[PDB]
Write a protein that binds this ligand. Structure first.
Ligand SMILES: [Ca+2]
Ligand SMILES: [Ca+2]
Ligand SMILES: [Ca+2]
Ligand SMILES: [Ca+2]
Ligand SMILES: [Ca+2]
Ligand SMILES: [Ca+2]
Ligand SMILES: [Ca+2]
Lengths: 528, 527
């Protein structure tokens, strides 16, 4: 009895949501159709289909472009409704081969592509015009996901729920604010952020930092505490922090910063030192590649006190003032080699980059923890911690029914640490093992973030979060890696591991990324 | 067909050499006997026996104490001779179970413990009084090793070849000098170091650094280039290096250092910054735990130009002056937190620690490379590189015939780097997997260094080289990991990996060791 009647329903005018990337939103709005380019929902042919969700906020998080990193460009969410009655069939989390057999399908054709079988429809349809499969394989969310037959999905009426592609590189600002709207009235840990307008934050922080560095009298005194380009220490960076807090423009934040109510001088100073060390990387560029470096420096949230700032009565001002101070501090501390860049343009880029990162962090900080901290055989390194969800997750089955496999890894940090999750390195083999990017995600505090996976095809592949992910004890994350297996004989994996890459390491101009490695067992038994 | 006639011989008054640690040398000298404490040559009962070598210089390298790290204490080498005739039986590198069956021994008893079987003696002895097995499983050296039956070994006459246990913490000075004597008259790259007296180097470097730091006029001028305890930079450290080199006491090295003939100012300056950062570790201590930190900081050899200094005509003076400058430079750059340590005592401890390390490094520098640089699936991290010797090495067989297994890993650095090989973390299981320390070693430039292995018994084990090993492209090393497997049912390995730990990493007072990890395949098949 593979059907789960308690979750299966028959719905009239069935409506669900689908998030589309900038390149695909316009084609999706004009009609749902199997794309010729891409994976068509799954690298496993059995599960190829149109994927929707009952959570329009979760669909909004799948509008981020994965063309670039921190591009700020988003697509939009479509509301898709069927004519007539639809059967949402819930089934057990089993392999497609087993599902095909227990539901009376042909084993030699894809499972989802057969949801419109005449015989299958009569037996399980409950009289409905079609059947849409509720997603068997799990997700960290309390949301429900649906897999549609590609030919059936052509019958959907498509409408715009929300779109961000007309905002250009400010689209993800609106996506972040729209997703957070699930926390707003009509929940002690769930914070509504409606009092923060990201356009206000960017414009006010740009004005505030401009007024400060245009005060030549004040800026010269800032040269006594620290001279731009010289080696910055925690003592120098802390004094530079408090010298900046003395300016009239930071009066709303001075008290709360000095007391620990919003952040701490020691947290911003430690982040400033780490930002200056990270920019000694010859490949880095503070003016033209600001996001690349700031994205891999730990503790940006605590350098802003963002978890504190979003609960303050004067929220927008506190956030503007905390971001402004951190931008001015980083610009004063960043190493100078050769001709120094224009300080005003440097502060502008630093403020812009900080806001690009704070938006995503503020969304995660407004949500209570949802992911387990317990793992099997955790690995730790420089604050970074990764472990297997359960014993069963530390496995890869390349035999028996071939197809979609899953691996769940617990991602966290040591107490007081905030580690960027940059990417995961996984094993692939062009003959029999594929990474399944569209179906890979990371769950943190109820937010589901898609993964963008690329091929080195030296039997290695890299997967990166399409949105910045920072790991802490208070915000543990679960990485859901999806693989696809196909039929082979005598195939093997010489490196059965998963690498977790974090913050940048710098030792005497030499650069690497913080890494932890987990090892799994490869099962080649085609018995089960 | 297991017998190798081309390598088997029949010898009268067969003599070989055995290196004993400080704790065991005196009991070995009075007679050879199976020790009640320890592994008795091998954690595998089949291979338990007395182990000797035909190379007395390699035996000297197995006299170092493994009680402590960089203790400077060594035991000695005994020359052991049998009465009458001995047959050295060379056999193929096979498992003891296969050897026992093919040689007509009982399969239910230890192999080496059966070398005095009457039938075995008659068939394979060639008329000799005993049979001594040449070590089947390999080693990187061109030396020959012999495995003796423990009851047979009681017949050996024991003499002293050389001993170092009367030198206290200076035994390894003489052991290093005695081992290098294999390069001395009676190949361009093999360097004889007979012109260096390590006791002179310590005495002269202590005198030289004292004369400098007792020069208040000169020392005050050194506070302008750098003030003790202040943030060390590469630029500041380089100027500190050149300011020290201007002193009259460094005139014999000033020219060669400035030109690159012996080291380079940038090499000494980079090491000084890294030493200063490493001593920001809250657990480190520059005065009482100097060796602990200096042992895990890359590039000590190039900070001395040791490979150049040992080829110089004025060898001892160049080496004395090179060590003196690095000690004064490091003492000037090391962070000062709280009450500062006495500057003279810090320079003293830094000079002695550098000499404690330079002796081993100079021995490796006097030898041409012998180990391959090509490996299977190398892993790299911050200059550290480790790979499997061959595809067969990336495997562990816990089934089939149980017993002694081997894993060879190629260890090197990236071009221009000198990475300390601190230790290797391996997997063990009290039920079926044991680390086999006595038979684990690392070979670098023809020198065989013993491994000391300890237990976490959380399914992990740590093995460290008993002498400092620094990895470079010009001095590749091969780590020989030895395991023992025993009979088990359903035993499994959750972490089939080997960690290789190198230099210390420093991030905002946070400390870890540079690590590279290799993964092998576990085979439980009963072939
Ligand atoms: Ca096509
Ligand atoms: Ca506005
Ligand atoms: Ca920009
Ligand atoms: Ca016997
Ligand atoms: Ca040999
Ligand atoms: Ca001492
Ligand atoms: Ca560092």
């Amino acid at each position: 009895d593979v059907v789960l009647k308690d979750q299966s329903t028959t719905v009239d005018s069935f409506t669900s949501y689908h998030g589309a990337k900038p390149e695909s939103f316009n084609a999706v709005l004009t009609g749902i159709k199997k794309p010729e380019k891409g994976s068509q929902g799954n690298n496993d042919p059995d599960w190829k289909g149109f994927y929707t969700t009952d959570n329009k906020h979760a669909a909004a998080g799948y509008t981020v472009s994965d063309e670039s990193v921190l591009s700020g460009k988003a697509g939009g969410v479509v509301r898709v409704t069927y004519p007539g009655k639809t059967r949402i069939l819930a089934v057990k989390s089993l392999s497609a081969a087993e599902l095909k057999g227990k539901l009376g399908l042909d084993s030699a054709k894809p499972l989802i592509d057969q949801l419109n079988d005449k015989s299958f429809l009569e037996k399980y349809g409950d009289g409905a015009n079609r059947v849409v499969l509720k997603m068997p394989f799990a997700d960290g969310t309390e949301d429900s996901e649906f897999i549609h037959n590609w030919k059936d999905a052509e019958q959907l009426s498509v409408e715009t729920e929300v779109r961000f592609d007309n905002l250009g590189k400010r689209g993800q600002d609106a996506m972040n604010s729209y997703m957070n709207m699930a926390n707003c009235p009509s929940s002690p840990g769930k914070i509504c952020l409606s009092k923060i307008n990201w356009k206000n934050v960017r414009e006010k922080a740009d004005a505030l930092t401009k007024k400060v560095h245009a005060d030549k009298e004040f800026m010269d005194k800032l040269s006594t505490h620290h001279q731009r380009g010289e080696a910055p220490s925690v003592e120098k960076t802390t004094a530079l922090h408090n010298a900046l807090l003395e300016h009239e423009s930071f009066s709303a934040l001075k008290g709360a910063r000095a007391s620990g109510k919003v952040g701490a001088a020691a947290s911003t100073a430690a982040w400033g030192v780490a930002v200056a060390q990270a920019f000694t990387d010859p490949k880095a560029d503070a003016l033209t590649k600001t996001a690349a470096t700031l994205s891999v420096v730990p503790g940006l949230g605590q350098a802003l006190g963002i978890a504190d700032g979003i609960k303050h009565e004067n929220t927008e001002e506190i956030v503007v003032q905390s971001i402004s101070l951190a931008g001015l501090l980083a610009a004063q501390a960043i190493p100078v080699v050769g001709e120094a860049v224009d300080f005003g343009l440097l502060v502008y880029q630093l403020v812009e980059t900080i806001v690009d990162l704070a938006t995503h962090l503020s969304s995660a900080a407004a949500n209570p923890p949802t992911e387990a901290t317990d793992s099997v055989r955790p690995a730790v390194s420089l604050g970074l911690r990764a472990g297997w969800k359960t014993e069963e997750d530390a496995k890869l089955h390349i035999g028996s029914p071939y197809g979609m496999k899953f691996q769940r890894i617990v991602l966290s940090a040591e107490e007081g640490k905030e580690i960027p999750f940059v990417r995961a390195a996984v094993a692939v083999d062009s003959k029999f093992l594929k990474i399944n990017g569209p179906r890979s995600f990371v769950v943190q505090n109820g937010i589901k973030t898609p993964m963008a996976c690329f091929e080195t095809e030296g039997n290695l592949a890299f997967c990166r979060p399409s949105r910045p992910i920072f790991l802490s004890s208070s915000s543990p994350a679960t990485l859901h890696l999806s693989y696809v297996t196909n039929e082979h004989e005598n195939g093997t994996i010489k490196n059965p591991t998963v690498d977790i890459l974090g913050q940048r390491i710098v030792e005497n101009k030499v650069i690497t990324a913080n890494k932890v490695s987990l090892v799994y067992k490869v099962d080649s038994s085609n018995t089960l």
